[PDB]
Amino acid sequence: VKKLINSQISLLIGKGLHEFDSLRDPEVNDFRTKMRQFCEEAAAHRQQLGWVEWLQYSFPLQLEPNRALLVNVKFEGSEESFTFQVSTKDMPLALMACALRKKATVFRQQPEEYALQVNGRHEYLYGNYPLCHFQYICSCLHSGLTPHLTMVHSSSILAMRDEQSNLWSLEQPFSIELIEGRKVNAMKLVVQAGLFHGNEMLCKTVSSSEVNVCSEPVWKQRLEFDISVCDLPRMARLCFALYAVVDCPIAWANLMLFDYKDQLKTGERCLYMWPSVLLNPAGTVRGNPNTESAAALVIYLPEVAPVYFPALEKILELLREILERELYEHEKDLVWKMRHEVQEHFPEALARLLLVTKWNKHEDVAQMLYLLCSWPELPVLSALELLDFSFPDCYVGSFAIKSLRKLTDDELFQYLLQLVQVLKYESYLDCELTKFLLGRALANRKIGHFLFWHLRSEMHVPSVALRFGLIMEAYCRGSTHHMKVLMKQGEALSKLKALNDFVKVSSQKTTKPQTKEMMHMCMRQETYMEALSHLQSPLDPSTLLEEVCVEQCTFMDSKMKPLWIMYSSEEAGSAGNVGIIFKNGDDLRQDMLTLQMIQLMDVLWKQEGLDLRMTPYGCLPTGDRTGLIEVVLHSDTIANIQLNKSNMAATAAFNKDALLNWLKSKNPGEALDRAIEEFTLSCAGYCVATYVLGIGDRHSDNIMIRESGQLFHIDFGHFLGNFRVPFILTYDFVHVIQQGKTNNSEKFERFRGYCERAYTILRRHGLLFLHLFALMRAAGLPELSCSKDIQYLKDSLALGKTEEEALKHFRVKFNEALRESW
Ligand SMILES: CC(=O)Nc1nc(C)c(-c2cc3c(c(S(N)(=O)=O)c2)C(=O)N=C3)s1
């Protein structure tokens, strides 16, 4: 019945749906019901899409940001296949017609009714794009393999779609009654509070009277705040901090002064507080659900009788350029004076205007919101700024989502990590961002995939557990089939957790080979073989993890014993030979963010025609200190290469030549030049990427080389110079760039040219990183917690410099890095 979906969702999110009901909360109850009906509307629209439109849902195109190639094509009900000489500039339609003419001769007797599936994968090639503009063809051309595609008819694609179906009057000062506590401490107890509107204060922070660590301490004091009640903004947020004194932080707690129906909150409130590292504005406005052992304040918010926030209709009724590109009071007031001409001539400066409006005075808010509701939509870049906690107001928030609707699915994917973390800054469950992310997730299954996992990865955190569970529950109402697909993934990871816990215990007692043999026995059980096999990869749902290749599975010797899990496929061939690494015990978010930013750098470089040959490999947290990492096969560490062990192809007279002999052995004869280029390009990319991102602790063990020449980085424990990390040039890579010559300035200075181009391209999108890192502060990443972390980026890119000045400064750091190389 309905009941089976509920128990499946419950298992899928790690939080039973009985628990949502047991709160008796009207906001939860109205989120669930209102978002259920919204996601079910999507699910209906989804099942009546056309077959091409369904491919757009299920397998959205992997596109890149003349010349010949072999393509091998087959038809779905056949092993008999054909090979074709085609051009890289031809459409899929041209190729599909080629296939049908070779079939109509072999079988002796329309291209529009087909889609090319990438063999043994959930990737499809269709639409009016040249072959080399598809990521599969482009990947294939660099790596050198023949494409393997399959003609899938529309009736068979529709068969897939089928089987997935489901007010101003009050001028008194705002005040409270601080009643009492119920907590523990080692002195006297002070309760400082404050009215914040985002980061900014609506008035100074009024303390409570000092009182002894008496219980369960009692106060029964008025606190009177320096602000009229009519001047409270819609997102007025009252923020407490309980600490002790003769500073000693103990707890904190926030709540919105207006409830989710716009009503002002009266009367009594028990705030269940959270422990501390004093006053914490951006902290969540929901209480600690650990009600048993939580320090709890009770307070009263005076009755003033039922007063709702004014409806929008009521609100709407009620030297200049030189600065506009931190400002002084007169400059702020000149920016406010000319607010109408900001709307008319400089609409991209909305943010700076929003940071000069007095949010603690209500006429100014209406005068602002009046400008805001006719304000033209801004570019995607500008809207990512307005999502930050710096702009808490709902109309500004709702305006931002309105300017972000024109995000492409690829862009939305690009920023999905950051957008999810902004859900933590949200004050209420039902919000324009949630609905936006949910509606786009339900319109694109890849977006839907990754939204699920970004949320599912944080259910171990009580502050977001309720929000995230509910969103996940809503998504599942709107995609029964993808729920089941994801359960299969989660069942795989449950088994990997249990197999990894075995491997840890075992490794501490017996030898490496005997633990590996005993891992393989455990995997060869029905329950494991079934669970570990025949799923989609959480790292990339278009990757199919088919036959778990137990022989080649192992574990790595590092402290947490990450498992090495290899998968094969009959239908896919070499594309089906894929590896994943399950790591349990480490917080992979730090890594994931670092790889996504390098991926973005790659995207931004390719958009200016620069292909530095990066390796943007999957990294995805899936659970508490648990996640997956995509295996880049056919690669080894600089450490393992430079070991220089004998009876190998890299038998080297000098350790400087170990890499170059290694590259030689893997790329013999004419192909050595192609790999040194791959190496050089990739070396330059990661050199810049590490310098901008401030990635420290780089040694041979955590730098890998692919057998193509491509270099890339692993293990991102520290970033943004969290030990001012300088540019890193390594002699043995310099040796490879220079083709093993001691003096080869032409090949070396090309590499400086690549590094400089790469560095100047990121400086132009400096604001994109600044905005995206600003939104990431929401995550509570230990090394992304303050302004000096964001200042690192500003200084690494040199964002307040002229392009000429910054390039001069970059070349100092580069020449310094060159000197350091021996
Ligand atoms: C042939 C081979 O081995 N290729 C590899 N490709 C990748 C992507 C590896 C990797 C990446 C990362 C991490 C690890 S690991 N083993 O340290 O967990 C391993 C980690 O922790 N963060 C990122 S290894």
CSV table of N, CA, C and O in Angstrom, one decimal, residues 349-420:
chain,number,residue,atom,x,y,z
A,349,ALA,N,24.5,46.2,-8.7
A,349,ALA,CA,24.9,46.7,-7.4
A,349,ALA,C,23.8,46.5,-6.3
A,349,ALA,O,24.0,47.0,-5.2
A,350,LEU,N,22.7,45.8,-6.6
A,350,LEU,CA,21.7,45.4,-5.6
A,350,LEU,C,22.3,45.0,-4.3
A,350,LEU,O,21.9,45.5,-3.2
A,351,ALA,N,23.3,44.1,-4.3
A,351,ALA,CA,23.9,43.6,-3.1
A,351,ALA,C,24.5,44.7,-2.2
A,351,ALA,O,24.2,44.7,-1.0
A,352,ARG,N,25.2,45.6,-2.8
A,352,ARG,CA,25.8,46.7,-2.0
A,352,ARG,C,24.8,47.7,-1.5
A,352,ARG,O,24.9,48.2,-0.3
A,353,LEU,N,23.7,48.0,-2.2
A,353,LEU,CA,22.6,48.7,-1.8
A,353,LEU,C,21.9,48.0,-0.6
A,353,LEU,O,21.5,48.6,0.4
A,354,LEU,N,21.7,46.6,-0.7
A,354,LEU,CA,21.1,45.8,0.4
A,354,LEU,C,21.9,45.8,1.7
A,354,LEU,O,21.4,45.6,2.7
A,355,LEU,N,23.2,46.0,1.6
A,355,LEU,CA,24.1,46.1,2.8
A,355,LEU,C,24.3,47.6,3.3
A,355,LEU,O,25.0,47.8,4.3
A,356,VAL,N,23.6,48.5,2.7
A,356,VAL,CA,23.5,49.9,3.3
A,356,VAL,C,22.1,50.2,3.9
A,356,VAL,O,21.9,51.1,4.7
A,357,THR,N,21.0,49.6,3.4
A,357,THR,CA,19.7,49.7,4.0
A,357,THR,C,19.6,49.3,5.4
A,357,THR,O,20.2,48.4,5.9
A,358,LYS,N,18.9,50.2,6.2
A,358,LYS,CA,18.8,50.0,7.7
A,358,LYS,C,17.7,48.9,7.8
A,358,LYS,O,16.5,49.3,7.7
A,359,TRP,N,18.1,47.7,8.1
A,359,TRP,CA,17.1,46.6,8.3
A,359,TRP,C,16.4,46.7,9.7
A,359,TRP,O,15.3,46.0,9.9
A,360,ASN,N,17.0,47.5,10.6
A,360,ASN,CA,16.3,47.8,11.9
A,360,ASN,C,15.4,49.0,11.9
A,360,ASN,O,15.1,49.5,13.0
A,361,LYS,N,15.1,49.5,10.8
A,361,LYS,CA,14.1,50.6,10.6
A,361,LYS,C,13.1,50.2,9.4
A,361,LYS,O,13.6,50.0,8.3
A,362,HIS,N,11.8,50.1,9.7
A,362,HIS,CA,10.8,49.5,8.9
A,362,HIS,C,10.5,50.3,7.6
A,362,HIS,O,10.2,49.7,6.5
A,363,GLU,N,10.5,51.6,7.6
A,363,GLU,CA,10.2,52.5,6.4
A,363,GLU,C,11.3,52.2,5.4
A,363,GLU,O,11.0,52.1,4.2
A,364,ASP,N,12.6,52.1,5.8
A,364,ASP,CA,13.7,51.8,4.9
A,364,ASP,C,13.6,50.4,4.2
A,364,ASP,O,13.9,50.2,3.0
A,365,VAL,N,13.1,49.4,4.9
A,365,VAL,CA,12.8,48.1,4.4
A,365,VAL,C,11.8,48.1,3.3
A,365,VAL,O,12.0,47.5,2.3
A,366,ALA,N,10.7,48.8,3.5
A,366,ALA,CA,9.6,49.0,2.5
A,366,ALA,C,10.2,49.8,1.3
A,366,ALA,O,9.9,49.4,0.1
A,367,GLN,N,10.9,50.9,1.6
A,367,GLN,CA,11.6,51.7,0.5
A,367,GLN,C,12.6,50.8,-0.3
A,367,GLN,O,12.7,51.0,-1.5
A,368,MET,N,13.2,49.8,0.3
A,368,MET,CA,14.0,48.8,-0.3
A,368,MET,C,13.2,47.8,-1.1
A,368,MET,O,13.4,47.6,-2.3
A,369,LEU,N,12.4,47.1,-0.4
A,369,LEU,CA,11.5,46.0,-1.0
A,369,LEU,C,10.7,46.6,-2.1
A,369,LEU,O,10.5,45.9,-3.1
A,370,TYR,N,10.3,47.8,-2.1
A,370,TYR,CA,9.6,48.5,-3.2
A,370,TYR,C,10.5,48.5,-4.4
A,370,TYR,O,10.0,48.2,-5.5
A,371,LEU,N,11.8,48.9,-4.3
A,371,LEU,CA,12.7,48.8,-5.3
A,371,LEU,C,13.0,47.3,-5.8
A,371,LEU,O,13.1,47.0,-7.0
A,372,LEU,N,13.1,46.4,-4.8
A,372,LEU,CA,13.3,45.0,-5.1
A,372,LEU,C,12.3,44.3,-5.9
A,372,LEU,O,12.6,43.4,-6.7
A,373,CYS,N,11.0,44.6,-5.7
A,373,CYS,CA,9.9,43.9,-6.4
A,373,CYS,C,9.7,44.3,-7.9
A,373,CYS,O,9.0,43.6,-8.6
A,374,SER,N,10.3,45.4,-8.3
A,374,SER,CA,10.4,45.7,-9.8
A,374,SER,C,11.8,45.7,-10.3
A,374,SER,O,12.1,46.1,-11.4
A,375,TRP,N,12.8,45.1,-9.5
A,375,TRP,CA,14.2,45.1,-9.8
A,375,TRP,C,14.4,44.1,-10.9
A,375,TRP,O,13.9,43.0,-10.7
A,376,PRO,N,15.1,44.4,-12.0
A,376,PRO,CA,15.4,43.4,-13.0
A,376,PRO,C,16.2,42.2,-12.6
A,376,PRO,O,17.1,42.3,-11.7
A,377,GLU,N,15.9,41.0,-13.1
A,377,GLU,CA,16.6,39.8,-12.8
A,377,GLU,C,18.1,40.0,-13.1
A,377,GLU,O,18.5,40.6,-14.1
A,378,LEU,N,18.9,39.4,-12.2
A,378,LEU,CA,20.4,39.6,-12.3
A,378,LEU,C,21.0,38.3,-12.9
A,378,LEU,O,20.4,37.3,-13.0
A,379,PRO,N,22.3,38.5,-13.4
A,379,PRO,CA,23.1,37.3,-13.8
A,379,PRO,C,23.3,36.3,-12.7
A,379,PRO,O,23.3,36.6,-11.5
A,380,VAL,N,23.4,35.0,-13.1
A,380,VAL,CA,23.6,33.9,-12.2
A,380,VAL,C,24.7,34.2,-11.2
A,380,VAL,O,24.6,33.9,-10.0
A,381,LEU,N,25.8,34.8,-11.6
A,381,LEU,CA,26.9,35.2,-10.7
A,381,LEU,C,26.4,36.1,-9.6
A,381,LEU,O,26.7,35.8,-8.4
A,382,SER,N,25.7,37.1,-9.9
A,382,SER,CA,25.2,38.1,-8.9
A,382,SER,C,24.2,37.4,-7.9
A,382,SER,O,24.1,37.8,-6.7
A,383,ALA,N,23.4,36.5,-8.4
A,383,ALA,CA,22.4,35.8,-7.6
A,383,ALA,C,23.0,34.8,-6.6
A,383,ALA,O,22.4,34.7,-5.5
A,384,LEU,N,24.1,34.2,-6.9
A,384,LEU,CA,24.9,33.4,-5.9
A,384,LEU,C,25.4,34.1,-4.7
A,384,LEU,O,25.5,33.6,-3.7
A,385,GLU,N,25.6,35.4,-4.9
A,385,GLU,CA,26.0,36.3,-3.8
A,385,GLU,C,24.8,36.5,-2.9
A,385,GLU,O,24.9,36.4,-1.6
A,386,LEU,N,23.6,36.8,-3.4
A,386,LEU,CA,22.4,37.0,-2.7
A,386,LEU,C,21.8,35.9,-1.9
A,386,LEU,O,21.0,36.1,-1.0
A,387,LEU,N,22.2,34.6,-2.2
A,387,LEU,CA,22.0,33.5,-1.4
A,387,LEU,C,22.7,33.4,0.0
A,387,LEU,O,22.3,32.7,0.8
A,388,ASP,N,23.8,34.2,0.1
A,388,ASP,CA,24.6,34.2,1.3
A,388,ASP,C,23.8,34.7,2.5
A,388,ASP,O,22.9,35.5,2.3
A,389,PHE,N,24.2,34.3,3.7
A,389,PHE,CA,23.5,34.8,4.9
A,389,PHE,C,23.6,36.3,5.1
A,389,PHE,O,22.7,36.9,5.8
A,390,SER,N,24.6,36.9,4.6
A,390,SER,CA,24.6,38.4,4.4
A,390,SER,C,23.3,39.1,3.9
A,390,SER,O,23.1,40.3,4.2
A,391,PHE,N,22.5,38.3,3.2
A,391,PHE,CA,21.2,38.8,2.7
A,391,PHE,C,20.1,37.9,3.2
A,391,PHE,O,19.6,37.1,2.4
A,392,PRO,N,19.7,37.9,4.5
A,392,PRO,CA,18.7,37.0,5.0
A,392,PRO,C,17.3,37.1,4.6
A,392,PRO,O,16.5,36.2,4.6
A,393,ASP,N,16.9,38.4,4.3
A,393,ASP,CA,15.5,38.7,4.0
A,393,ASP,C,14.8,37.8,2.9
A,393,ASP,O,15.5,37.4,2.0
A,394,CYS,N,13.6,37.4,3.2
A,394,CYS,CA,12.9,36.4,2.3
A,394,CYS,C,12.6,36.9,0.9
A,394,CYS,O,12.7,36.2,-0.1
A,395,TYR,N,12.3,38.2,0.8
A,395,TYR,CA,12.0,38.8,-0.5
A,395,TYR,C,13.3,38.9,-1.4
A,395,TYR,O,13.3,38.6,-2.6
A,396,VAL,N,14.4,39.2,-0.7
A,396,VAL,CA,15.8,39.1,-1.3
A,396,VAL,C,16.1,37.7,-1.7
A,396,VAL,O,16.7,37.4,-2.7
A,397,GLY,N,15.8,36.7,-0.7
A,397,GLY,CA,16.0,35.3,-1.0
A,397,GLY,C,15.2,34.8,-2.1
A,397,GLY,O,15.7,34.1,-3.0
A,398,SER,N,13.9,35.1,-2.1
A,398,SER,CA,13.0,34.7,-3.2
A,398,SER,C,13.4,35.4,-4.5
A,398,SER,O,13.2,34.8,-5.6
A,399,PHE,N,13.9,36.6,-4.5
A,399,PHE,CA,14.4,37.3,-5.7
A,399,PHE,C,15.7,36.6,-6.2
A,399,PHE,O,15.8,36.5,-7.5
A,400,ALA,N,16.5,36.1,-5.4
A,400,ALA,CA,17.7,35.4,-5.8
A,400,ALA,C,17.4,34.1,-6.5
A,400,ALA,O,17.9,33.8,-7.6
A,401,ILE,N,16.4,33.3,-6.0
A,401,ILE,CA,15.9,32.1,-6.6
A,401,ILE,C,15.3,32.4,-8.0
A,401,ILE,O,15.5,31.6,-8.9
A,402,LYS,N,14.7,33.5,-8.1
A,402,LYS,CA,14.1,34.0,-9.3
A,402,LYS,C,15.1,34.3,-10.4
A,402,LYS,O,14.9,34.0,-11.6
A,403,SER,N,16.2,34.9,-10.0
A,403,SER,CA,17.4,35.1,-10.9
A,403,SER,C,18.2,33.9,-11.2
A,403,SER,O,18.9,33.9,-12.2
A,404,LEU,N,18.1,32.8,-10.4
A,404,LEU,CA,18.8,31.5,-10.6
A,404,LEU,C,18.0,30.5,-11.4
A,404,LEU,O,18.5,29.5,-11.7
A,405,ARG,N,16.7,30.8,-11.7
A,405,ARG,CA,15.9,29.9,-12.5
A,405,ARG,C,16.5,29.7,-13.9
A,405,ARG,O,16.4,28.6,-14.4
A,406,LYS,N,17.2,30.7,-14.4
A,406,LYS,CA,17.9,30.6,-15.7
A,406,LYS,C,19.3,29.8,-15.6
A,406,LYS,O,20.0,29.7,-16.7
A,407,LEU,N,19.7,29.3,-14.4
A,407,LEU,CA,20.8,28.4,-14.3
A,407,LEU,C,20.5,27.2,-15.3
A,407,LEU,O,19.3,26.7,-15.3
A,408,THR,N,21.5,26.7,-16.0
A,408,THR,CA,21.4,25.5,-16.8
A,408,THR,C,21.5,24.3,-15.8
A,408,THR,O,22.0,24.5,-14.7
A,409,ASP,N,21.1,23.1,-16.3
A,409,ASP,CA,21.3,21.9,-15.5
A,409,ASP,C,22.8,21.6,-15.2
A,409,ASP,O,23.1,21.2,-14.1
A,410,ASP,N,23.7,21.9,-16.1
A,410,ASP,CA,25.1,21.7,-15.9
A,410,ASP,C,25.6,22.7,-14.9
A,410,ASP,O,26.5,22.3,-14.0
A,411,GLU,N,25.2,24.0,-14.9
A,411,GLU,CA,25.5,25.0,-13.9
A,411,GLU,C,25.0,24.6,-12.5
A,411,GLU,O,25.7,24.7,-11.5
A,412,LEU,N,23.7,24.2,-12.5
A,412,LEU,CA,23.1,23.8,-11.3
A,412,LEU,C,23.8,22.7,-10.6
A,412,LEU,O,24.1,22.7,-9.4
A,413,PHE,N,24.2,21.7,-11.5
A,413,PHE,CA,25.1,20.6,-11.1
A,413,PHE,C,26.4,21.1,-10.5
A,413,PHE,O,26.8,20.7,-9.4
A,414,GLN,N,27.0,22.0,-11.2
A,414,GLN,CA,28.3,22.6,-10.8
A,414,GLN,C,28.3,23.2,-9.4
A,414,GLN,O,29.2,23.1,-8.6
A,415,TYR,N,27.2,23.9,-9.1
A,415,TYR,CA,27.0,24.6,-7.8
A,415,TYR,C,26.1,23.9,-6.8
A,415,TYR,O,25.9,24.4,-5.7
A,416,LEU,N,25.7,22.7,-7.1
A,416,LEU,CA,24.7,22.0,-6.2
A,416,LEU,C,25.2,21.8,-4.8
A,416,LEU,O,24.4,21.9,-3.9
A,417,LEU,N,26.5,21.5,-4.6
A,417,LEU,CA,27.1,21.3,-3.3
A,417,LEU,C,26.9,22.6,-2.5
A,417,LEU,O,26.4,22.5,-1.3
A,418,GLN,N,27.1,23.8,-3.1
A,418,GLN,CA,27.0,25.0,-2.4
A,418,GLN,C,25.6,25.4,-2.0
A,418,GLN,O,25.3,25.9,-1.0
A,419,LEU,N,24.7,25.1,-3.0
A,419,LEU,CA,23.2,25.4,-2.8
A,419,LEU,C,22.6,24.5,-1.7
A,419,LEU,O,21.8,25.0,-0.9
A,420,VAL,N,23.1,23.3,-1.6
A,420,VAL,CA,22.6,22.4,-0.5
A,420,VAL,C,23.1,23.0,0.8
A,420,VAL,O,22.3,23.0,1.8
